[PDB]
Design a protein around this ligand. Structure first.
Ligand SMILES: Nc1ncnc2c1ncn2[C@@H]1O[C@H](COP(=O)(O)OP(=O)(O)O)[C@@H](O)[C@H]1O
Ligand SMILES: Nc1ncnc2c1ncn2[C@@H]1O[C@H](COP(=O)(O)OP(=O)(O)O)[C@@H](O)[C@H]1O
Ligand SMILES: Nc1ncnc2c1ncn2[C@@H]1O[C@H](COP(=O)(O)OP(=O)(O)O)[C@@H](O)[C@H]1O
Lengths: 106, 102, 104
């Protein structure tokens, strides 16, 4: 059979774990149907270093939030995140992806 | 100067309990490698998946595969995600070494 | 909110060579990077079993680097001799960002 694929976007949101609730609140408010969080990251930015812990998930961690969302949501989400990254460390990467079940993401 | 070749990349997010089923399917289809990211949390349509503080309840499998494999792989994963939690993301990527992946 | 085209590298390699990789990224003028640790995987020759990994040198990492298109060629050239002799892979993605100046 033909396995049909559909267009979606995937956001990768990298920021300090201390702001996880603000971020996931924003995602929920915008109507994102799910998200995945990768913790204990390291990284280098324009100003500071984040050393990933070698034993546990500490509170002052760097995290990445992965969120697959319909095209129509990208614009409003970035506007929502605009004041945040205007104020805080981190980045947003927008990807084009394909998924098998459009309804799962709306 | 440095030539690139087209490939597809799958991100397969699912419960750690099913790691072997997932990797068996990738292997059977002839996937030459994959990467498993542990220590995840997440929110789904019905529940929260809380990551451990130190084992891996939710995982993400990254698998770069030739285009010809995507169909067969999705067929393999269809009955699974029909019954179980998780998602598959298909990406277009580029790589430098085509034979490393087929 | 305008979006702009960029590339994103996913660089998977052994943790023992992390400094080599990050030095190369820094030297080439890459403005930032993010490292995902504690990875396991299956490679061309062997299995990298996470439970069998105990040192940071033996573990796999994934370095995520968002970079302008013009930087990709020279970066892959720098990594070319490394991956001839060492394990790991590089995935090149198309992405979009909002603050192009942040990445140059
Ligand atoms: N170009 C990039 N590619 C990948 N990750 C990045 C990039 N720039 C920043 N990051 C991630 O975001 C974090 C925040 O960096 P940045 O936004 O420059 O804040 P600061 O000014 O405090 O360093 C970095 O430590 C890194 O993990
Ligand atoms: N839109 C999404 N973006 C990113 N990750 C997602 C998305 N939807 C689901 N996931 C990941 O898959 C996991 C399972 O989701 P789901 O299959 O909806 O579980 P549930 O049984 O709770 O409905 C989530 O915890 C999340 O980590
Ligand atoms: N097709 C692939 N998709 C995703 N990750 C891969 C793939 N091939 C290799 N990798 C990642 O790179 C690691 C090293 O692979 P490889 O260079 O083939 O190792 P070796 O040749 O030393 O056995 C793997 O363990 C995996 O994490």
């Amino acid at each position: 059979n033909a396995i049909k694929l559909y267009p979606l976007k995937k956001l990768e949101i990298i920021l300090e774990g201390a702001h996880k609730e603000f971020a996931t609140d924003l995602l929920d408010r915008a109507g994102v149907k799910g998200y995945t969080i990768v913790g204990n990251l390291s990284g280098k930015g324009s100003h500071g270093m984040y050393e990933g812990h070698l034993m546990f998930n500490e509170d002052d961690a760097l995290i990445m939030i992965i969120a697959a969302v319909p095209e129509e949501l990208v614009g409003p989400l970035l506007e929502g995140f605009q004041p945040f990254f205007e104020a805080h460390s981190g980045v947003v990467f927008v990807h084009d992806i394909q998924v098998g079940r459009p309804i799962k993401f709306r």
